[PDB]
Amino acid sequence: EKVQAERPDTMLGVVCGALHVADVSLRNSVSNFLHSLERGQV
């Protein structure tokens, strides 16, 4: 129908998605690493 409009620029969209995914993964990794440290693990 040629109605796939109102999308952001592909560059900004993919950069944003990569930033969100990486930020979630890094925060979870750091949290679990510190949790392991707190319990006495190395």
Curated annotation (Swiss-Prot):
Posttranslational modification: The biotin cofactor is covalently attached to the central biotinyl-binding domain and is required for the catalytic activity.
Tissue-level expression: Expressed in brain, placenta, skeletal muscle, renal, pancreatic and adipose tissues; expressed at low level in pulmonary tissue; not detected in the liver.
Subcellular location: Cytoplasm, Cytosol
Record's subunit section: Monomer, homodimer, and homotetramer. Can form filamentous polymers. Interacts in its inactive phosphorylated form with the BRCT domains of BRCA1 which prevents ACACA dephosphorylation and inhibits lipid synthesis. Interacts with MID1IP1; interaction with MID1IP1 promotes oligomerization and increases its activity.
Domain-related comment: Consists of an N-terminal biotin carboxylation/carboxylase (BC) domain that catalyzes the ATP-dependent transient carboxylation of the biotin covalently attached to the central biotinyl-binding/biotin carboxyl carrier (BCC) domain. The C-terminal carboxyl transferase (CT) domain catalyzes the transfer of the carboxyl group from carboxylated biotin to acetyl-CoA to produce malonyl-CoA.
Function in brief: Cytosolic enzyme that catalyzes the carboxylation of acetyl-CoA to malonyl-CoA, the first and rate-limiting step of de novo fatty acid biosynthesis. This is a 2 steps reaction starting with the ATP-dependent carboxylation of the biotin carried by the biotin carboxyl carrier (BCC) domain followed by the transfer of the carboxyl group from carboxylated biotin to acetyl-CoA.
Annotated disorder: Acetyl-CoA carboxylase-alpha deficiency: An autosomal recessive inborn error of de novo fatty acid synthesis associated with severe brain damage, persistent myopathy and poor growth.
Name used for this protein in its record: Acetyl-CoA carboxylase 1
Species, as recorded: Homo sapiens
Residue range from the parent sequence: 619 to 660 of 2346
